[PDB]
Amino acid sequence: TSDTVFVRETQIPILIERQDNVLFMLRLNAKESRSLDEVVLNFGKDVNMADIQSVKLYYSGTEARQNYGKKFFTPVSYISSHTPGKTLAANPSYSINKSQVNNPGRKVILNANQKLFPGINYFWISLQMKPGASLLDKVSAKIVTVKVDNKEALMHTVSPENIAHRVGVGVRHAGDDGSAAFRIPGLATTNKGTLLGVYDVRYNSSVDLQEHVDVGLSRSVDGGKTWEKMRLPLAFGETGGLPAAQNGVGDPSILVDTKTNTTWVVAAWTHGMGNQRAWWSSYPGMDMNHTAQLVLSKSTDDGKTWSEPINITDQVKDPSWYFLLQGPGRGITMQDGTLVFPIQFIDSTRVPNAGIMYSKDRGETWKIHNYARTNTTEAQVAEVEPGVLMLNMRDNRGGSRAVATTKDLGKTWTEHPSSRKALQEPVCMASLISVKAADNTLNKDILLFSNPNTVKGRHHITIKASLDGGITWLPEHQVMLDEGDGWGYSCLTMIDKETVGILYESSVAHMTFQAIRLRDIIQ
Amino acid sequence: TSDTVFVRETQIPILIERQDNVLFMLRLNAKESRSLDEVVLNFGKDVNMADIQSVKLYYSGTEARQNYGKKFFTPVSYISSHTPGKTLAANPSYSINKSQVNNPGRKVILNANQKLFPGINYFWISLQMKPGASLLDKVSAKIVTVKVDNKEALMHTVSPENIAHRVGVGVRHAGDDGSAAFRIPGLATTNKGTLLGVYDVRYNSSVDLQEHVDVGLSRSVDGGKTWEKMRLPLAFGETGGLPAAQNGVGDPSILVDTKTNTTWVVAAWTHGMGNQRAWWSSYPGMDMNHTAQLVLSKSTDDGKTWSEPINITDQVKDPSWYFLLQGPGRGITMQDGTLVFPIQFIDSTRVPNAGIMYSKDRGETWKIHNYARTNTTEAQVAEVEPGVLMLNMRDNRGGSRAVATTKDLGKTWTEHPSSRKALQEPVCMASLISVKAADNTLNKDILLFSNPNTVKGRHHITIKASLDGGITWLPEHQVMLDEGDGWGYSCLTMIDKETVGILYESSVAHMTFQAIRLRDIIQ
Ligand SMILES: [K+]
Ligand SMILES: [K+]
Questions:
Q1: Quick check: A69 contacting B, CB < 8 Å?
Q2: CATH number of this structure's domain A1-164
Q3: Which candidate, A205, A522, A275, places its Cα nearest to that of B122?
Q4: CA within 20 to 30 Å of B174's CA: A314, B77, B111, B493, which one?
Q5: Contact B62 A272 (CB under 8 A)
Q6: CA distances from A318 to A328, A393, B433 (A)
Q7: Chain B residues with beta carbon closer than 8 angstroms to that of A114
């Protein structure tokens, strides 16, 4: 009986700056087959071939005998998203480049000429884009033929038809600017159309506070196609005479004041605490020697320069709380001009609760009333209707987002019908934004939500849209961006009236940016 | 305990090439204390000050409040032995240099001028040697006084008196020559006095075979003071057309044929097996497509150049075995000229057993008879009496080395009285060598043994000596080299008649070499 070539097409971001991106994985258990001669690939008729730099065929060897029958399509991860300075190209010890076509036409014949191991053989196709490719590029392709021993082999494709591969930008890769890792994205759009992406700069490792951590900022003036040199809006160094690794600041949240175009970044500055996690090393009290400090930096020049830190802890923290901080990601300006950041606090019973913090005087003073729900942490807030705030919350009970609304800035809360039902989660950060009819090309109020669409692990990062104020999230109104494993956090914004932007922790880069046409999500 | 300065002196190798080495750790829980001002350090009168470049005082901040009762002396590891390119100097985000004295005299005055955190404060003293320091350098020192608020503070020292700090050489540091890690040391001395140290070059990570692994070799012609550029006696690259990471070779063992000065390195070449562990991926058979290959490289020019691989699997592997490989470390030449390497094999029931393979014809042919003991793995062999081989084995039953002897090259074995009693272990590689009276300065037959002297974890690397063929290992005949945590493998050799050499995985470098006067061990 003939050997079958199994094909799995990927559904992960193709990074424009990467030298390799995994497009297809092939697996052949060679019982009769002696040689794989060539693979024939055909790109879709609508693909812009001028944006493609190269297509490559790699051989990645065999599998351990105990793993036969587990349906793996690779023996190992081919391209690192963690090794500093080694995240742009395939690890050459794992994959052998058999052939490559630079500036291909729509039909590509990739010469393998690979004698097969008597057993499982892994191959894959790498796609490399030109550095200037459009972020709205979609790539589709089919493997048409695989020639084995000078005959067309039987094929079986396990992945779905009509995959649209999307490109992206790795705004931050592991190792960039001397930092081991980047985590915890926030993203907003200024009134000038400028994109501001913030994140933790985790210099020593990927671990959470306490550690040597700054808040970094990447600024783009061309819709996310290019990003300016990293800025550091918040950084505490050797403040108070303690080492820099005992002065981390992180979990940033960004908002743009739409009335003035002033941008605010809020984060948690942790002082002391040895090398332990702030989540259980911040204690009751008010000063830096006991408890995490809530600090702001503002920019009045469209994100180019940033103020010294403004410590607002004494305005909003109850002394008996262990830890008050922002919900990472972004905040909002309400229609009436109120600025709002989601927040979370570990109360005096050591239980975390989400809520909101607001300012009615353009960020000069801030107020918190009551929590929305017990035993919740990271949350994002959206003005779903004028004067009605919806808080969408990470819930420690597991499995699904909690949702509540308030009409009085968090004095009182009402459980939403979608709560603990509509949006499954693995207990992870999620992004929520509201986009009003006046501001988007669909002329409909929409909610957009992003998270790992799973209840276990962090994978299948998905943007979901709701047309009925978050009551329903229809399957047809969703785009799955990244099937791979990552750290899972994401943040949304509108790039313009027709286009969604997302900054997130992906399987391919610590900070990944993608642009998605709104009409691709809601067709 | 408040306002007492607690002191812990380290017992770890001082690497000659490091810019920092941790010599003392200080902890002060400051209740009444406001500033730590001045620390006075006095080196022992026998210390060679000309070999010391500088002494530094670092402040490393505070501790998490939940750990105040745990009696730690640091908040974090100060100097990495794992981060590529960053293993030579204190991480400056963890430690602030408050004071430094270059070209010190015997009495050193360090001025901290450090305002104290209201709570735990950590300080430490760094010792930096001059590049040409002697390997037999011993350094002793005492903290004489610590001034807090311009008064001499109460001091309490928790570490023992009369610590002799030894220097060492980091033959390989994580990241050297493009390799993430180095593991599994072997060490021998040629008839010319040349030191040959071998190890795994684990390019991608510290993970065991299968992976991209070569056998590396460092050669020293000056007693271990300096080491020549790394050689690669065994490396298989893309053999058979598989990726380099499916062609690893490792767990080397080295022996010098004392009759001819030819040096032999034996290692296990694993071909295929995906990215899984060879221990569970090698299967019965003889071909490279099924089972690990036992390969040799020889040097007939005092270790300078190495033959192409010699595959001896067919001579010594039983087809029914899952896996045959050498015991890592070294082999020997018996008095009568027989070459012997320890080995281990996973038999058809998938149980490992240690034994020996030998050659009576200068390495042309090799033979294995019977295992010494079931459910044993890594072992080292020594000729404890003429014609009597002692095999000292890692025993999966836990807690202690197994020991057996054979008078017929492994046809029959006798359990030694010391077996499973005399030498505790955490189930780890251990080194054993025999040194005849005529070959050392004491004119006594001795055995030397090194391992992590513990039943839990890999730390307290210790050299032990025996005068009665391993029946007794007296406490006074031991030197503890490294109290820190590491990967635990070690290998001994005689540098010359007066001096022991050890190459090992230490808490300060992946491949650490130290030279120890024999009379320091058996006084
Ligand atoms: K509109
Ligand atoms: K052979």
A1: no
A2: 2.60.40.1290
A3: A275
A4: B493
A5: yes
A6: 20, 21, 66
A7: 241
Q: Do domains A1-164 and A165-523 have the same CATH topology?
A: no
Q: Look at the alpha carbons of B381, B386, B388, B392 in this order and tell me if their dihedral is positive or negative.
A: negative
A275 to chain B: which residues are within 8 Å by CB? 64, 75-76, 94
With contacts defined as CB-CB under 8 Å, which chain B residues touch A60? 243
Q: What DSSP designation does B510 have?
A: S
Q: Is A285 an 8 Å CB contact of chain B?
A: no
Q: Report in angstroms the alpha-carbon separations of A129 from A176, A406, A501, A511.
A: 21, 46, 20, 19
Q: Which of A94, A203, A276 sits opposite B245 (nearest CB)?
A: A94
Hey, is A105 helix, strand or coil?
Answer: coil
d(CA A86, CA B180): 12
- Provide the phi-psi class of A103: left if phi over 0, else alpha when psi is between -120 and 50, else beta: left
Phi, psi of B415 (to 5 degrees): -60, 130
How many whole angstroms separate alpha carbon A268 and alpha carbon A214?
10
Q: Does B70 touch chain A (CB under 8 A)?
A: no
Give the closest-approach CA distance of A459 to chain B in angstroms. Answer: 22
Nearest chain A residue to B62, by CA: A274
Q: Are strands A141-148 and A154-157 parallel, antiparallel or unpaired?
A: unpaired
Task: Please name which of B15, B10, B1, B5 lies closest in space to residue B504, comparing C-alpha atoms.
Answer: B15
C-alpha distance from residue B428 to each of A38, A230, A306, B42, B267 (Å): 48, 47, 54, 39, 18
CB neighbour list of residue A405: distance below 8 Å, 6 or more residues apart: A384, A388, A389, A390, A391, A413, A414, A416
Q: How far apart are CA B277 and CA A374, in angstroms?
A: 46
Ligand nearest to the CA of A518: 1
In chain A, which residues are last before a break of more than 2.5 Å from C to the next N? none
Residues of A designated as active site = 378
Q: Which amino acid is at B71?
A: K
Q: Letter for the amino acid at B48?
A: N
Residues B145, B5 contacting (CB under 8 angstroms): no
Q: Is A117 near chain B, with CB under 8 Å?
A: yes
CA distance A491 to A470: 17
Q: What is the resolution of this structure in A?
A: 1.9
Q: How far is residue B397's CA from residue B392's CA, in Å, rounded to a whole number?
A: 14
Size of interface A-B (CB pairs under 8 A): 122
DSSP B398-449: -SB-EEEEESSTTSS-EE-TTTTTSSB-SS---EEEEE-GGGSTT-S-EEEE
Calpha distance B122→B157 (Å, rounded): 14
d(CA B295, CA A127): 39
Which residue in this structure is represented by tokens 């040895």?
A274
φ/ψ of residue A321, rounded to 5? -75, 145
What SS3 class is residue B518? helix
Query: For the sheet containing A181-189, what is the strand order?
Result: A181-189, A195-202, A213-220, A231-234
Q: Which two tokens stand for residue B92?
A: 């400056």
- Residue B9 Cα to ligand 1 midpoint, Å, equals 71
Q: Kindly determine whether residue A276 and residue B67, on different chains, have CB atoms separated by under 8 Å.
A: yes
Query: Which listed ligand is nearest to B314 at the C-alpha?
Result: 2
The angle at the Cα of A397, spanning A396 to A403, to the nearest 5 degrees, equals: 80
A165-523: CATH topology is Neuraminidase (2.120.10)
Residue B270: closest CA among chain A residues belongs to which residue? A64
Residues A272, B238: C-beta atoms closer than 8 Å: no
- Indicate which technique resolved this structure: X-ray
Show which of residues 219-248 on chain B sit within 8 Å of chain A, judged by CB atoms.
Answer: 238, 241-246
Domain positions in chain B are 1-164, 165-523
Strands A376-385 and A388-395: antiparallel
Q: Which of B87, B148, B66 is nearest to B113 (CA)?
A: B148
Are the beta carbons of A59 and B244 separated by less than 8 Å? no
